[PDB]
């Protein structure tokens, strides 16, 4: 069996220095070519460069020459990627790849991917929410919702319906704005419970331990 | 235990088999050359005709031979190749000894064409032998050297280099033995001895190959298994054309068109000027030694500065020594116009041999390591075909004009073709390690 | 360098059919093309190399074809686990360039999109924060248009929309839009509207709420 392990979950201030590890097990690193690949959010893959562990030759992409370095160590059987002068653009997912020769047909094995985030601020999230029932007519729609804003530097795991999760509940994808994060989740079920005894939504911030629950009241 | 270890091992048996095969197939080749010369007597023209027929046949047939190799089972292929080659040797020897016993009798037994019919039959059988030898060389070297070397690029390199050194030593020591034997009795006995050697060698080689197969279990898994001649030819050639390593493979081929290469030039010029009788042995020794330094330099450069840069440095060396040769031929001293001059020419040829062997090893390793396994047959057969096509063009050039000014023009044209080959390799290099083509130090 | 392009980004396919992914190169690259499959939060894996040969362990329903400039990947009788991302790579020359990639989805009966409106929260208003939110749920066509007609005017400022992904339950898509304004801006108005230009009907569904209620 062959596999490659990477460190992950890296948060970096812009302009700093960062290293990414790639540890190979099951084979000798010096016998292959090691390639590094970048993946931007909702963007295609890009090729960074490759290294020969035998003699340490490195070829990079022209657009990546000035700010990318690749090193290898055969004694510890590892490879390292060096990025310098990081901006907010550089946040991405990075992959380690193994190739046979100069013009090898394929990459047979890949890493697990490392998430690199160039961030500036860290704080806690604010959860302001309210169900709209101002001059409504139908009482068979329910359709309550909650909105959490200004997530500091993590991804919230808000759960609604107070563990009585009805199948009608959608967690909208979070979006970045003013260096913070915002998200919302709407549940439209149990129309008889609208106005009557209802449940609450609980949101927890892993990086801030901000586990708070709020119950949606009527207008 | 260490000595016993190697003596068994898995590399040593392969070395032994290759050595025996090359020894037999070179002794027989030179014996065939001498016999036909004795029979006819016309030198230069007939040797060229034989070489032309051989090359013209092998091009077309190896194009298909590669396909036949890649889509069958390894053990079967090797066994079949050995059997065919050795049976061919035996039959050709039988016919040669028959024509020797009754030359004039066959000349008039029924018609004057019996002799010519026997001659063309000899050519045909000696040709079939060469096709069999090419097939076994392709399969053994490419496939088995790749698979038995495992994943260690360094071991692959050392094994290729050792094969090429065995080949040069066998060339320099074989002709001599053939001579001693042929010149110790009536020709009919030399032929008999060579045939017997070939048969016993075939048996021992089959046993050795079976033994090697038993020690590399990865030699049995073939990925891919688990009118038509024209189609195969076309598909093979287009596959060669579309390969990412095309410009490299062509670069080697252009190196074959040259009168500056040994054998032809030494025989021609020494016969025209400078027979001596002892200098030729010194030249043979020098050629062998420089081939050996070429191999060792290839190994060292591959270990230090990588493959592509090794190719570029080898090319620089060969081109420099051939510029020495061109300065030589243009001298007012007049080798032939258009003692110092012949020395300069031979020195140029020798150092060019160094560079050429380094470059050839580089290209061979590139082919071995960058070609997908299922095509380890098509591509190599096509490359052999192209090399012998350029060799045929060289023969055409040699036979066309046999005058001295013609020799000068031939030198210039051969240097030009070597230059064009190295320019194509440089383009291949730039397409890979772009910009950082220089900077040997990492 | 060689630029690789995949023309179509979305393949709306049903189960059991045959689909064809197209990859067109800008130069005569020959045969040196490989294909990859990757799923969300995973690493890509081999499917086909040299445009014809398959990789050991891959199912047989995957086939590759094409040559010279145009290449195609054919899927026969696909099932519920082939819904992933596919792209084509070349290795004819350096630098190596990857295709843009194409993603697959599933078919479903066309459906209309629901709508809802919500006024600015009183707690946020106390903290001088005004933000209106509209949520459309269970749409049939992924493409949709929204027009927040604030004070009878399609104000194209301070509006953020976030669409969800196709649900494995009912194979539907949902979206949510938010418009953030100043506390005084909300007070200095009495008209707020939001229209949805879906493909289900020519009638633009619009829900509104005055600033007096
Ligand atoms: Ca033999």
Author numbering:
A (entry chain D): 20 to 238
B (entry chain A): 15 to 240, 289 to 400, 452 to 555
C (entry chain C): 21 to 233
From the reporting publication:
Ferroportin (Fpn) is a transporter that releases ferrous ion (Fe2+) from cells and is important for homeostasis of iron in circulation. Ferroportin (Fpn), encoded by the SLC40A1 gene, is the only known Fe2+ exporter in human. Activity of Fpn is regulated by hepcidin, a small peptide hormone secreted by hepatocytes, which binds to Fpn and reduces iron export by inhibiting its transport activity and triggering endocytosis of Fpn. We have shown previously that Fpn is a Fe2+/2H+ exchanger, that is, the export of one Fe2+ is accompanied by the import of two H+.
We determined the structure of nanodisc-enclosed HsFpn-11F9 complex in the presence of 2 mM Ca2+ by cryo-electron microscopy (cryo-EM) to an overall resolution of 3.0 Å. The density map reaches a resolution of ~2.4 Å in the transmembrane (TM) regions and allows for the building and refinement of a structural model that contains residues 15–240, 289–400, and 452–555, which covers all 12 TM helices. The 12 TMs form two well-defined domains, with the N-terminal domain (NTD) composed of TM1–6 and the C-terminal domain (CTD) TM7–12. The current structure assumes an outward-facing conformation in which the NTD and CTD make contact on the intracellular side. In the density map, we noticed a non-protein density corralled by four helices (TM1, TM3, TM4, and TM6) in the NTD, and assigned it as a Ca2+ based on the following observations. The side chains of five conserved residues, Asp39, Gln99, Asn100, Asn212, and Glu219, are within 4 Å of the presumed Ca2+ density. While in structures of Co2+-bound HsFpn, the side chains of Asp39 and His43 point towards the central cavity between the NTD and CTD to form S1, the side chain of Asp39 in the current structure points towards the interior of the four-helical bundle to coordinate Ca2+. When the NTD and CTD are aligned individually with their counterparts in the Co2+-bound HsFpn, the NTD has a root mean squared distance (RMSD) of 1.32 Å and the CTD 0.51 Å. The larger RMSD in the NTD is due to deviations of the extracellular halves of the TM helices and the extracellular loop between TM3–4. The bound Ca2+ is not solvent-accessible in the current structure.
